[PDB]
């Protein structure tokens, strides 16, 4: 994944998730993508209520992108792998 500053364009399924979280732009930095992904998970309350580093994304469009039913914020590889599949570097 590109560093800080580099601009990326998300593929449509990911862009849609970011738009749900309030994103109005079409071009992002990776950190901005991560901001809106966190916003989305928070707004949709996909985090486990008792162990909140666990995200339950099954039965949500986010899980179709991540290809896993749950993940840990402390084990973010599925997130990064998804971003590599879904970000076009500009």
């Amino acid at each position: 994944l590109p560093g800080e500053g580099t601009q990326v364009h998300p593929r449509a399924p990911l862009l849609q998730i970011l738009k749900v979280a309030g994103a109005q732009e079409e071009v992002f930095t990776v950190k901005e993508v991560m901001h809106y992904l966190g916003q989305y998970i928070m707004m949709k309350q996909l985090y486990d209520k008792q162990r909140q580093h666990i995200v339950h994304c099954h039965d949500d469009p986010l899980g179709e992108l991540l290809e896993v039913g749950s993940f840990s914020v402390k084990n973010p590889s599925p997130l990064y792998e998804m971003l590599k599949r879904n970000l076009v570097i500009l």
């Binding site: 991560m34 966190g38 928070m42 909140q52 580093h53």
Partner: peptide, 14 residues
Amino acid sequence: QETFXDLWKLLLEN
């Protein structure tokens, strides 16, 4: 007892 919002911000900035 950390919240999701604090946990994700740590990820985001790391």
